[PDB]
Amino acid sequence: AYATQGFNLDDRGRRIVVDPVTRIEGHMRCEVNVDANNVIRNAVSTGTMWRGLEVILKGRDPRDAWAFVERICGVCTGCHALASVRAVENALDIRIPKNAHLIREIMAKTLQVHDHAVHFYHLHALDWVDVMSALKADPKRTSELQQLVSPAHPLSSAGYFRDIQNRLKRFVESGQLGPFMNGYWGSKAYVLPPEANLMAVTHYLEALDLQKEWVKIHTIFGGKNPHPNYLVGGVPCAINLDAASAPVNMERLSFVKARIDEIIEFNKNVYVPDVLAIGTLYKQAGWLYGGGLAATNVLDYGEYPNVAYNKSTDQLPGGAILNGNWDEVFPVDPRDSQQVQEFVSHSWYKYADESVGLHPWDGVTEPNYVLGANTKGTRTRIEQIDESAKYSWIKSPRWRGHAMEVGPLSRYILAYAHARSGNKYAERPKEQLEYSAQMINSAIPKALGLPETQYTLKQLLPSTIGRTLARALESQYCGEMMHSDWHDLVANIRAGDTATANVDKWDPATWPLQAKGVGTVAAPRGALGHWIRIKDGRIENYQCVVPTTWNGSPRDYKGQIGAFEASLMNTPMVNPEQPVEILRTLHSFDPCLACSTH
Amino acid sequence: KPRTPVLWLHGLECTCCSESFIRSAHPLAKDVVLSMISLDYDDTLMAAAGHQAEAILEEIMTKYKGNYILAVEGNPPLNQDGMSCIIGGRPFIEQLKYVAKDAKAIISWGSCASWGCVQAAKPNPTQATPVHKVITDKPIIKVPGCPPIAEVMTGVITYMLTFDRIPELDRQGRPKMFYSQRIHDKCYRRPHFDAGQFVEEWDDESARKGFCLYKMGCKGPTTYNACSTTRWNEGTSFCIQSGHGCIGCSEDGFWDKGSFYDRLTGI
Numbered sequence A: 001a002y003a004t005q006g007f008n009l010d011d012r013g014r015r016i017v018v019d020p021v022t023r024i025e026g027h028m029r030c031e032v033n034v035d036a037n038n039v040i041r042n043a044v045s046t047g048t049m050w051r052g053l054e055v056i057l058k059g060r061d062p063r064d065a066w067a068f069v070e071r072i073c074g075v076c077t078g079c080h081a082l083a084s085v086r087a088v089e090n091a092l093d094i095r096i097p098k099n100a101h102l103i104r105e106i107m108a109k110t111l112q113v114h115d116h117a118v119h120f121y122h123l124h125a126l127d128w129v130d131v132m133s134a135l136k137a138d139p140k141r142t143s144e145l146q147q148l149v150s151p152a153h154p155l156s157s158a159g160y161f162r163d164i165q166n167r168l169k170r171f172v173e174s175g176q177l178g179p180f181m182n183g184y185w186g187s188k189a190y191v192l193p194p195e196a197n198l199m200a201v202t203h204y205l206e207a208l209d210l211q212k213e214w215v216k217i218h219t220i221f222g223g224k225n226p227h228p229n230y231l232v233g234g235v236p237c238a239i240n241l242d243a244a245s246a247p248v249n250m251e252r253l254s255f256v257k258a259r260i261d262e263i264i265e266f267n268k269n270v271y272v273p274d275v276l277a278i279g280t281l282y283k284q285a286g287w288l289y290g291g292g293l294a295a296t297n298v299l300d301y302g303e304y305p306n307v308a309y310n311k312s313t314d315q316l317p318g319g320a321i322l323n324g325n326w327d328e329v330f331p332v333d334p335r336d337s338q339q340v341q342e343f344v345s346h347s348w349y350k351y352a353d354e355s356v357g358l359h360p361w362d363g364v365t366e367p368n369y370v371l372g373a374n375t376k377g378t379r380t381r382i383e384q385i386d387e388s389a390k391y392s393w394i395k396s397p398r399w400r401g402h403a404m405e406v407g408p409l410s411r412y413i414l415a416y417a418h419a420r421s422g423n424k425y426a427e428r429p430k431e432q433l434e435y436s437a438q439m440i441n442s443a444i445p446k447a448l449g450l451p452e453t454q455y456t457l458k459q460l461l462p463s464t465i466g467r468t469l470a471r472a473l474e475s476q477y478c479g480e481m482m483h484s485d486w487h488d489l490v491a492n493i494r495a496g497d498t499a500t501a502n503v504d505k506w507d508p509a510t511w512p513l514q515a516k517g518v519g520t521v522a523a524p525r526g527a528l529g530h531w532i533r534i535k536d537g538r539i540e541n542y543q544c545v546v547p548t549t550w551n552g553s554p555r556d557y558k559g560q561i562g563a564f565e566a567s568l569m570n571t572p573m574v575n576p577e578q579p580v581e582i583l584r585t586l587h588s589f590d591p592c593l594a595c596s597t598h
Numbered sequence B: 001k002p003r004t005p006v007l008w009l010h011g012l013e014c015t016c017c018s019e020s021f022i023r024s025a026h027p028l029a030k031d032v033v034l035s036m037i038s039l040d041y042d043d044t045l046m047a048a049a050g051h052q053a054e055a056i057l058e059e060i061m062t063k064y065k066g067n068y069i070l071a072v073e074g075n076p077p078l079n080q081d082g083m084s085c086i087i088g089g090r091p092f093i094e095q096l097k098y099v100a101k102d103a104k105a106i107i108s109w110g111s112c113a114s115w116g117c118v119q120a121a122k123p124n125p126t127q128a129t130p131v132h133k134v135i136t137d138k139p140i141i142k143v144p145g146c147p148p149i150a151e152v153m154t155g156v157i158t159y160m161l162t163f164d165r166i167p168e169l170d171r172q173g174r175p176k177m178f179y180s181q182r183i184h185d186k187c188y189r190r191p192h193f194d195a196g197q198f199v200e201e202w203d204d205e206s207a208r209k210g211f212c213l214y215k216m217g218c219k220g221p222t223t224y225n226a227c228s229t230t231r232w233n234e235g236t237s238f239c240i241q242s243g244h245g246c247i248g249c250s251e252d253g254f255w256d257k258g259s260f261y262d263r264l265t266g267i
């Protein structure tokens, strides 16, 4: 047992192993210890994959890097490409033209919506929704619930819900349950009534059909999804109105706007209402676990400047909050060697001195797969990992030595803090949060005949429910922002500016003989940075610190826990052998393990 | 009639192939999962985790012995004693070999499973190895690309389920029905190539007229895929239509064939 960050860690209880953690991207192992009453008192995050992209990049052309690092992840597809071209542009002092800026912003906001909505329905929902309970639902009462949860959603008839229920019935009655096989159906951890389950399963299927439409925005500007193309100096999708011969003409821009308008309807009518409704019902059940580090320490680099290269205009303004003090946002500088640092004390890597954290411009990725003396099992057959030693392929990022949570929740807490200090660029997220708190506390309870509650945002946001809510609100805000970006792009083109690439420094003969750069992105899961050193036209060092690296990190030199481990602490389990609560909270971070390890 | 079980394993990967699969418009991935296959194991989508997830593999392999499909996304690493990819506390290669032994057919999804893709690019720190170099005694269909086109992935599944056969393969084990053409054969910019009409700098007048991308490093002339005709995301675009050269992403070792922006020699 030891105390850290206000958590009393104790490994004396019953050990539970979850390997694999499913409904994530990539490979994770989780172990917990539970006390005599099935309460988690210790949690261990193990990243169970590594590929070594940082090693592979050495000696290659900086102009090619975006395509290599894009393949860190096909779920957060393109955010690494964006970080990479930003890092190279930063190193070489390249300013991209306005149309390239706006097209990159539209592609980024398209990824946010697609990634968030697919996460919630296809990965997260089965932690809240019992599909077998959906089979017991009354189609008429499901119709009535749908009209209360989202009056504007046109797909609400008893007949519609009956037809979906009948397809689920036929599927289950076949005895081939496929993705539902060996599920935790009927666990007391599930609290939704049958009608809410059937509504959610219906929206799971709606989202699966619609998500493929949203990414056609990537296909227009970037050729394909997954893995759209980027370019150092701008975008490849040259503009010609008068013209079908150019990648981008008015017909292609009209097509993009049609896709954006569909996204805005989905976020407003399906996704946000479902998360408000499910959040309200789990709040009513008292399930406010999973706050972890969100109650104290949150970080984001800040993103979406409404004026390009002007960080004061970030529409998701960033920084760092410590100790739950929302009255003080510290500025975060990705260039400062004393701010972002990575430890490998408890990671399968080696440094000269593992008592220190390296800033990514000085970063080192040398693998060291070695298990501690207290391991149960062998090097190739682990029964119980030894978290006192090296236990993960994830490095341990810290900010000025502090363990931070990153992600949509971090950005929404930071936006709220900024708005309260008088930042007008954060007005929309503040409005969404106050609207959401009123719906969860008052409006939805009144509509469902449940008691009204008086939770503050300070109380509601640092929770697994709050983390899930912030992701849905961020999806909505990103759809609204890209709608504005589309108008600005078309207006700029119509005013006569058709430029899409700055090629002044394309040829490496023009480059300084050495340079360093950093590119940051508010990626779907939180704060992304790429740090590059260039020498004689080649990559000298390339280090990535990725959002799930922050959240999924193992303990640092001081033994401080990361966001995943903190979030699981002090959570009761209905059945320690069914990881329902573990999955619900881990999934609320939207873990991307290929991202975390790269 | 039972729907053929699919056990979809994930090794070292980025999950682009799983994402591409659900972009399919014809057929819908929804209809494939509910009505065509039984997707019984898939880390991305499955309800069960940990012990409950791993218990599915033995159940399906017993009940459907020699009558399930093994689909592999990603690849096994041979370095770090295989523990640069751990599933259930054991090397991924042990899971791959176990599930492969009683499969009717093996699909190598994407360039990772087919050839190695980005993790196998020099200097391949994990010794990431394609499936067909580990599983040498089972019929394997390679579906390369980073990722493959959505309709190519669902087209392979549809053929295999309709006919209970692997489609005709080329010498490299790729389905001829999707990989018989080079990008350059039917690329809509080919008339520009034939006239010596090329982009020389990004966003030059030639780029705005959709001139050929050969001199910007397009690897279409040496790359077999359906991108020029089938195209991407229900035929919306492809790399070249949106203004970037083909980087050769369906070809073995495309990461180590020089800069994406260096033109091919001997036009």
Ligand code: SF4
Binding pocket: B183, B184, B185, B187, B188, B189, B190, B191, B193, B211, B212, B213, B214, B218, B219, B220, B221, B240, B245, B246
């Ligand atoms: S753009 Fe590429 S594939 Fe198309 S004609 Fe030119 S070289 Fe061939």
Ligand code: SF4
Binding pocket: A224, B145, B146, B183, B223, B224, B225, B227, B238, B239, B240, B245, B246, B247, B248, B249, B250
């Ligand atoms: S055009 Fe070339 S790079 Fe683009 S997806 Fe097709 S094969 Fe891959």
Ligand SMILES: [Cl-]
Binding pocket: A086, A096, A101, A104
């Ligand atoms: Cl940018």
Ligand SMILES: [Cl-]
Binding pocket: A119, A120, A124, A468, A471, A587, A588
């Ligand atoms: Cl979510």
Ligand SMILES: [Cl-]
Binding pocket: A367, A368, A369, A370, B080
């Ligand atoms: Cl090692």
Ligand SMILES: [Cl-]
Binding pocket: A369, A370, A371, A372, A379
């Ligand atoms: Cl060891």
Ligand SMILES: [Cl-]
Binding pocket: B111, B112, B115, B116, B117, B118, B251, B252, B253, B254, B255
């Ligand atoms: Cl390859």
Ligand SMILES: [Mg+2]
Binding pocket: A054, A395, A543, A544, A545, A546, A598
């Ligand atoms: Mg890194």
Ligand SMILES: [O]
Binding pocket: B013, B014, B015, B016, B017, B074, B109, B110, B111, B112, B113, B117, B145, B146, B147
């Ligand atoms: O892949």
